[PDB]
């Protein structure tokens, strides 16, 4: 149940923007927020009209259309106070100061975020 963004530490949260994914605080404007919603045995990441978190390979990360499965639709779960998102190959999503957003096989904080709502 979410209609805003995911905090990846420090104070920035994955958000969408123009034709690409970015990380912002909260702030101005809008319109490229992000919605969590369930899908059968897992959960989906969906921006407002046609787009679901998607991962390519080689640390390349983007967003695809509607579909069923994992990789695109995801399995994401809470963590005490934080969150963790996971898709294919046993990787979780990552957001690292140094290498922006990608995914990692490990799982501790670097691949664990907050949940921000409205």
Curated annotation (Swiss-Prot):
PTM description: Phosphorylated.
Pfam families reported for this sequence: Fascin
Gene3D superfamilies documented for this protein: 2.80.10.50
Major location category of this protein: cytoplasm
Renumbered residue ranges of the record's region Contains several HHXH repeats: 8-109
Subcellular location: Cytoplasm; Cell membrane
Keyword set includes Lipoprotein: yes
Annotated GO MF terms: actin filament binding; actin monomer binding; fatty acid binding; lipid binding; protein-macromolecule adaptor activity
CDD domains, sorted: beta-trefoil_FSCN_HatAB
A GO cellular component entry from the record: plasma membrane
Subunit structure: Homodimer or heterodimer of hatA and hatB, linked by a disulfide bond.
Protein name per Swiss-Prot or TrEMBL: Hisactophilin-1
Gene that encodes the chain: hatA
